[PDB]
Amino acid sequence: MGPGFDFAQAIMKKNTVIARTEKGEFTMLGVYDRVAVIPTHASVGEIIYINDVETRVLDACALRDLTDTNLEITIVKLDRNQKFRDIRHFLPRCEDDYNDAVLSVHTSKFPNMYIPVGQVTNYGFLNLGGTPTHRILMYNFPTRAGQCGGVVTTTGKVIGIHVGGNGAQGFAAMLLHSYFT
Numbered sequence: 001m002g003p004g005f006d007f008a009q010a011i012m013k014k015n016t017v018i019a020r021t022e023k024g025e026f027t028m029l030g031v032y033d034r035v036a037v038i039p040t041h042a043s044v045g046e047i048i049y050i051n052d053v054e055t056r057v058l059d060a061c062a063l064r065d066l067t068d069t070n071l072e073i074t075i076v077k078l079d080r081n082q083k084f085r086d087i088r089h090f091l092p093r094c095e096d097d098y099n100d101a102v103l104s105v106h107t108s109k110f111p112n113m114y115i116p117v118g119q120v121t122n123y124g125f126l127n128l129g130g131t132p133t134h135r136i137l138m139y140n141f142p143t144r145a146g147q148c149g150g151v152v153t154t155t156g157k158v159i160g161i162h163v164g165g166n167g168a169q170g171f172a173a174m175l176l177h178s179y180f181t
Contacts, residue, residue, distance in 0.1 A: 028076075
């Protein structure tokens with residue numbers, strides 16, 4: 001509809017796959033080379049399905065901050081014959097608040113879905129499904145099951161991936177440039 005949706009669509013069309021684990025179907029953001037991210041609660045194993053194709057996982061790292069607190073991001077290196085467009089230059093360097101964000105989802109359940117979630121707060125600490133979690137972003141949108149792994153963007157930045165909600169608010173894990181140096 002406008003330049004928020006334009007940037008969101010450009011990321012979705014080139015930098016997303018559908019990932020399936022034993023815990024469900026997720027939007028999966030490709031960041032560079034064969035490296036992608038998914039919420040830690042997906043429980044990535046040795047094998048993952050990528051666009052319904054059996055794929056070996058070459059490496060998987062569940063990120064935690066230096067206080068040993070969950071960040072809810074798993075970095076996955078996929079045994080794929082093709083690289084992602086390098087989008088590391090769209091990642092923020094620091095924790096921040098944002099205006100005018102879009103949440104974009106692509107799954108068998110929600111194809112080509114784009115949600116204008118609006119203002120995004122640096123929320124920080126969240127007890128997510130019982131698990132103390134840091135670097136959470138919050139938006140005042142009633143996000144539903146099937147949105148996990150959804151990409152959060154502003155015009156020109158890729159700022160996080162959707163990891164849950166409480167029926168009134170949605171929560172994303174921050175993406176930072178330093179995760180992918």
